[PDB]
Chain A
Amino acid sequence: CPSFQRVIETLLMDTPSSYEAAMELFSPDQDMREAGAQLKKLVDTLPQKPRESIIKLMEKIAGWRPYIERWTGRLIVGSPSFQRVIETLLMDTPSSYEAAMELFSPDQDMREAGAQLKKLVDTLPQKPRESIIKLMEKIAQSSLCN
């Protein structure tokens, strides 16, 4: 989904304007905008090579189809693997985020890079992380990717 990946290109190595504009096209909420801004400031503090290695991880991950999760009755639009990366990064332990990365066979560089992101994301408060989740769910049902 090109228009989602330049949301990712601009998050990790481009200006907050280009990031905010890559996000805006998905018609985000306002909860999603402040939380998207808080994340961008943390992604800014990362040195370049971490981000460059993150982009390769992020885009190596990059299939979407809606299903209903077993036992829970939950609607997921994405893949179980992608959902796992999403929730462990934003709502679970560093160790569980780590194991979700190992699904996509990263090298040592993407590992240590993603571990810094997770360390960083964990400084956000609870509700912004939750908004970033509702934001990625928004992206998948967007009639952009389909």
Chain B
Amino acid sequence: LQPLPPTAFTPNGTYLQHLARDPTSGTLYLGATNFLFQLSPGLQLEATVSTGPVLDSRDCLPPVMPDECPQAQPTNNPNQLLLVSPGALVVCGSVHQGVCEQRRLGQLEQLLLRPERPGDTQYVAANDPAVSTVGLVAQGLAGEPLLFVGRGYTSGIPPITTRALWPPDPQAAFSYEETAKLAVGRLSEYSHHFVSAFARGASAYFLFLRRDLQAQSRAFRAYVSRVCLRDQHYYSYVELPLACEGGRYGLIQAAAVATSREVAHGEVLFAAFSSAPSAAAGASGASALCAFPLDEVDRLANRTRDACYTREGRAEDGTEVAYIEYDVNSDCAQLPVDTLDAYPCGSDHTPSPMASRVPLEATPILEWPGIQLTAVAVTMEDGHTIAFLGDSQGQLHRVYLGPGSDGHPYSTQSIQQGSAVSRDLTFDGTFEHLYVMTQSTLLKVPVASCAQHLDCASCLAHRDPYCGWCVLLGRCSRRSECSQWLWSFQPELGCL
């Protein structure tokens, strides 16, 4: 049982698509239809920017000119990508073939970088609001910021590109070089659908669905793929199928690593999956949370790279575990063991792009029927890992993932009934609030509300791992506030 959120932001006359937090300042940036918003941590506006609508047509290339593109009409610009970078906000709409721009952090109304005459290596985001775009900011071997972009197919732009944010010639911004791409023949048939991008260590990782054209089924399947964070070709690119309860929950929806004061980015990816590209809606559907240690992702990908480079795609027992994907003219090789160290990210003579026949397997930490999860955040309190999970019906569930749990949520709260929770769920600086976003509103939700129980008995009855009874203070609180504390989740003592 949870109170009404204390703070809301709701834009008049528009829908929300993305949220980005600047951790230096805590400033929130909101990408909406025809809008960009800059918000204080208390969800008060600092800046509003109009991004639309614009004269446009998907059959025309920008600049869109009336006398030159007669069928262009005003076109609404829902936001496709919103990312904080070392010196700029990166902004991509769906209008004008997905071109991007860069704006000043803390002064959103100030344009910093925008190519005036973009070419066809600078069409970044999906120019269809139905289709999803994901990105990742990272640094190249020289410190130059790079934009990794995961772009689903629109009714021929590489599904994954590595684009330069600060090229020395400013007119080249957001373009990828010839080889800084995943070259895929049949885009429309693979039909990538991207869910998230994240960096860890020396690699960039993508989570997506795509048809398994290699197998007989040609079914949509979940993948994690990994590429060297500075290999500005895709020599190191390797794909792994993702199995949650062996593929019963086939469609990956959202994912996050643990984030808290104790660790800014944990080592365990918590992915939400749904049974089946959309999940079954209503009672028929079911969702699962599967945890994958990133070190397991890296071992399977390593083994896959090692088999393809040095054993013609074979595991040590002679079984066929790695192959070349996307119909690219390339084969697994028997290169000298030497090349594993020489070329950790590959070269122009190493097999590419690689994939595993062997999936990464995980057992659900929760199976929930009739719930379609759409959003995952994970944090830690007094050492306990807690998951915050949003669903398609606008519900936020809080879940204890520690030992002894059975996967039931210890709290469910209605946020905006019927409106999917955005996967751009993220915490504030102190991990005291969750920023929950739907298509309609941005709410600032306190991770717990122990103070609402004024008596020991009610404090302990309403079980919540954040909360316990502080005897000397006589309050219901988090442990950290209790300057003897009876944990409501498992109380050492009673009130008498």
Contact = CB atoms under 8 A, between A and B. Distances in A.
Interface of A: 27, 29-30, 33, 65-71, 73-77, 79-80, 140-143, 146
B14 to A, nearest CB: 38
B361 interface: yes
A122 to B, nearest CB: 26
Nearest to B382: A70
A32 B263 CA distance: 31
B441 interface: no
Contact of B403 (A69, A140, A142): A69
A67 B404 contact: yes
B368 to A, nearest CB: 15
Please classify the interface of chain A as helix (H, G, I), strand (E, B), loop, or mixed, using the class held by over half of its residues. Answer: loop
A123 B397 CA distance: 49
A70 B246 CA distance: 27
B427 to A, nearest CB: 16
B363 A70 contact: no
A140 B243 CA distance: 15
A143 B245 contact: yes
Given A140-B363, A141-B363, 9 more contacts: A33-B317, A66-B363, A70-B385, A73-B258, A73-B267, A73-B380, A74-B268, A143-B361, A146-B245
B402 A67 contact: yes
B277 to A, nearest CB: 23
Of listed A27, A65, A68, A141, residue having the most chain B CB within 10 A: A68
Interface residues of B, number: 30
A142 B361 contact: yes
Contacts of B317: 30, 33
Given A66-B291, A67-B403, A80-B403, A73 B268 contact: yes
Contacts of B266: 73
B32 to A, nearest CB: 35
CB-based closest 10 A-B pairs: A30-B316, A68-B385, A143-B246, A70-B383, A71-B383, A68-B401, A67-B403, A66-B365, A141-B363, A75-B291
Contacts of A27: 358
Contacts of A66: 291, 362-365
Of listed B243, B268, B401, B403, residue having the most chain A CB within 10 A: B403
A142 B243 CA distance: 11
B64 to A, nearest CB: 50
B428 to A, nearest CB: 21
A12 B7 CA distance: 63
B361 A141 contact: yes
B405 interface: yes
Contacts of A74: 268
B293 interface: yes
Contacts of A65: 365, 405-406
Contact of A77 (B246, B363, B401): B363
B60 interface: no
A142 B402 CA distance: 21
Nearest to B387: A68
